[PDB]
């Protein structure tokens, strides 16, 4: 219902969206464009990394999980710098920067 109506943005529907990708997909189907019970890409993209930074998404020591969160929200610079710090994934982060360049 609230995937069709883009409502109840605060309720993460955790009963059915238990994975991270299920959350991203749940919200990107809820973002809106031009006051209550409404979320926009700017709020969502900022809300995610500002409040729930790397710390929240890298506790499982899985780096790509956070990268996908930033890249699939149009925050390409964040995801590039972030992934560029993983000494094992420097190569990959430089190139995804070149492509964007």
């Amino acid at each position: 219902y609230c995937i069709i109506g883009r409502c109840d943005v605060t309720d993460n529907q955790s009963e059915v969206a238990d994975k991270t990708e299920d959350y991203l997909w749940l919200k990107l189907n809820q973002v809106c464009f031009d006051p209550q019970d409404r979320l926009t890409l700017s709020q969502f993209q900022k809300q995610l990394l500002e409040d729930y930074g790397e710390s929240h998404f890298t506790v499982n020591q899985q780096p790509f999980l956070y990268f996908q969160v930033l890249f699939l929200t149009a925050q390409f610079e964040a995801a590039v710098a972030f992934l560029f710090r993983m000494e094992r994934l420097r190569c990959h982060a430089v190139h995804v920067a070149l492509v964007l360049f």
């Binding site: 993460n12 955790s14 969206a17 238990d18 994975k19 991270t20 990708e21 299920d22 959350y23 995610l48 729930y52 929240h56 998404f57 506790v59 499982n60 899985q62 790509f64 999980l65």
Partner: peptide, 8 residues
């Protein structure tokens, strides 16, 4: 309260 469990 988003989960941190990656789709595996």
């Amino acid at each position: 309260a988003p989960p941190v469990r990656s789709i595996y």
